[PDB]
Each structure stands twice: as C-alpha cells, then as structure tokens.
Design a protein around this ligand. Structure first.
Ligand SMILES: [Zn+2]
Length: 50
C-alpha cells in the first residue's frame, strides 16, 4: 500500500535478496526531469540511482 512497482533491478543493502521496488519521480514539475530511487520492500532499505 505504497506507490511503486516491483522491479528487482537492484539488491537491498541488508537482506541481500531481489525484492526491491522503485519509483521514478521528478522533484517539482514534470519539466525538471526524473530521479530514480530504489527501496527494499523487505526491511525498508532505500537509496537512489538517478
Ligand atoms: Zn532489506
């Protein structure tokens, strides 16, 4: 009950598995382009990629 998709491109930094979700948002406006964040659906370890 969050707003992301199961992608499994990056591993977590704890559970060391492949069940991470990512979202592609672009901070303030849709003309100030994308940022890719990756969040583990398992323990909740999150980091970014861009
Ligand atoms: Zn984790």
């Amino acid at each position: 009950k969050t707003g992301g998709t199961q992608t499994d491109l990056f591993t977590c930094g704890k559970c060391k598995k492949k069940n991470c979700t990512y979202t592609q948002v672009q901070t303030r406006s849709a003309d100030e382009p994308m940022t890719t964040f990756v969040v583990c659906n398992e323990c909740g370890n999150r980091w970014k990629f861009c």
